[model samples]
Target: KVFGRCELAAAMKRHGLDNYRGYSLGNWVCAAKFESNFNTQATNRNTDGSTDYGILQINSRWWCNDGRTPGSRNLCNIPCSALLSSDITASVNCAKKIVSDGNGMNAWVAWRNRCKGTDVQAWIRGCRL
Candidate 1:
């Protein structure tokens, strides 16, 4: 279930991503765009024996258990497979966990390099949200 831009924005808002942990909506939108292009089933295997999953490309090394990531913290307490669901509830929850643990939006490198400290308003310019 790939999401259109505004649809993804609305879903993220419903999940409380707007202003979550002092990050902007665009922070998430841009991160999703660059990280996984809003594809719910996206997965990126890392050279560090970890994988990033789902719309945010969440990492298996810490947040979710893929059974392959060494010393996985599994702080989100769910299988990495959950992060790939189109429903997005688990994925959003895990992302929030990353933030409250003090990682903030920097957990996504796409945000640091692309969305950080920028107006980002244009990312959602045409969205009626």
Candidate 2:
């Protein structure tokens, strides 16, 4: 499933994305747009054998456990399938863990490439947030 811009923004904010760890809400909107275009089932297989899953493109090696990666840590302690649902609450919860992994908002390369050095509030201009 895919989400409208405002819908995704509100979902993120509702799940504590607002000013999370010092990053603004817009950063998530911008990164999710670039990461998977708000796709709930988005999955990208990395050359190193890790797979990025869900709208946020969370990786399997260090985030969710897909039961396919060797020496998997399952740091998020969730099955990767949990992130593929449109509900996104579980996905959002897992992402928070990703953010605290010493990378902060930089956990997502999409955020670093698009939202970090850029003003992303435009992504949240409406929806009365």
Candidate 3:
């Protein structure tokens, strides 16, 4: 079945590239690609300090604020599956808000550039509704 492009677009619209802080959709996608290969359903067992889960790479260590284990949170608790099921749309939206009070996706832009990837900025400029 086709993904929820409409809902995804609507979410992006809330914090789009042309917003007050200039958050670019392409840039955010770039980060998502780098972070989780754009795999929202991706659940990884952390090899580092804390155990994190879900897409957009929400650190369960901090996200599990109620003294609950990572497993207990699952997809609902982490909300990664929801975002992943939508191709990282929700995570990107959440990150946009978090990056700068949901203002600008400047961090996403910079991250894309530093990753030695394509011109995400141009892509954003060319993206259609």
Candidate 4:
């Protein structure tokens, strides 16, 4: 909720996420739209008894801890609630950690299922960034 799509894109560009680690910012922006609609407070319960949190919909099963999911790796070493904040600095850093693990945006189901290989220029359409 902290940003509209354009604003978010600008921020990501400023954060140098445009093309880091071989992943395009277009992919990230598109995935973010699908994953949480840019809502920092977004959360969804998965059928597997886990939950996705924040703008990237990072999973408690691997990336973060909700204090409710057992056996969570908490690779980001961050509370899930932290990911839901308006300031996305920590979340962005954690996402980079995920990409470095070789998954790229494939770590996000939304990217794998909906955005992979799909043209996403429209995501930043009219965005002045």
Candidate 5:
């Protein structure tokens, strides 16, 4: 599958992040790498092996209580699992929401402020991946 930059940009726009650029994509990539390794459809079990699902590692329990429905209102209000199942753009939106409040590219900005190149190693070293 080909991942075009324009398509990704449109997806960001669809999700309400207008000025996504530079570190915006960077933040998306970071969330992808950390959360689901870029899998638009990814799920995991709890430490006790309970089922959880979604691209951004969203928990079905929390978001799908009324039953798994597309575009359900929750974190980002677009059914987390459906966000994964929909398309690459939806996946990117899900991740962008994880980073910011579905606003501008502040998620990426926050990431840069915390993990610029020279400081990335320092930042990662303290975290438990």
Candidate 6:
């Protein structure tokens, strides 16, 4: 959906994601691959009746509002649907806040399961960032 890895890398680089919050580009790339497979419109229903949205799979229960989760913290102050767009500005911004709040990439289960302690070089192998 992103045209390929390079495009995603370009976007990330353009957004200064390489060393965002002390996380590397490879980390973000690998997490994105597992989280949403580069699909910006990705969404997943959680067991708690909440949902994850966008490339980062940010949670509606904590980060954004989906109109279903009443009393949501909505820390990002944006609609969950906003994360479903191809333009990743909102997602990146919200993700930054999430990361800086001490969650790191650990906030994403995909990161812990697939990206943590793994060799994520392939996620950015051929990208000219």
Q: lDDT of each structure?
A: 0.89, 0.88, 0.46, 0.86, 0.45, 0.87
- RMSD score of candidate 6 (Å): 1.1
Please, what are the lDDT tens digits per residue for candidate 1 over residues 1-129? 999999999899999999998877878889999999989999999888899999999999889999988887788999999998889899999999987876688888888898888887667779988
Query: Any idea what lDDT model 3 has?
Result: 0.46
Candidate 4 residue lDDT tens string, 28-92: 89989998999999999988778999988888988999988887789999999999998887788
Q: Identify the superior model by TM-score, candidate 2 or candidate 6.
A: 2
lDDT of 3 by residue, 1-129 (tens): 122333333445554533424544555545555555644565565554444333355545434322444444332344434544544445545554456633343334336455435675543454455
Encode model 6's per-residue lDDT on 1-129: one tens digit a residue. Answer: 453787887888788788898888989988888888999989999988899999889998899999997667799999999999988889889988988887788888889988989887778887787
Ordered list by lDDT, greatest first? 1, 2, 6, 4, 3, 5
Itemize residue pairs with steric clashes in candidate 6. none
Pitting candidate 1 against candidate 3, the one with the higher TM-score is: 1
**Model 3 regions lying over 4 Å from their true place:** 1-11, 14-21, 64-93, 101-118, 122-126
- Candidate 5 global lDDT: 0.45
**What TM-score does each of the candidates earn?**
0.95, 0.95, 0.51, 0.93, 0.44, 0.94
Ranking according to TM-score, highest score first:
2, 1, 6, 4, 3, 5
Where model 2 places Cα greater than 4 Å from the true spot, the runs are none
Comparing 1 with 5 on TM-score, the higher-scoring candidate is: 1
Show model 4 residue runs off by greater than 4 Å: none
Clashing pairs in 1: none
Worst 10 residues of 6 by lDDT: 1-10
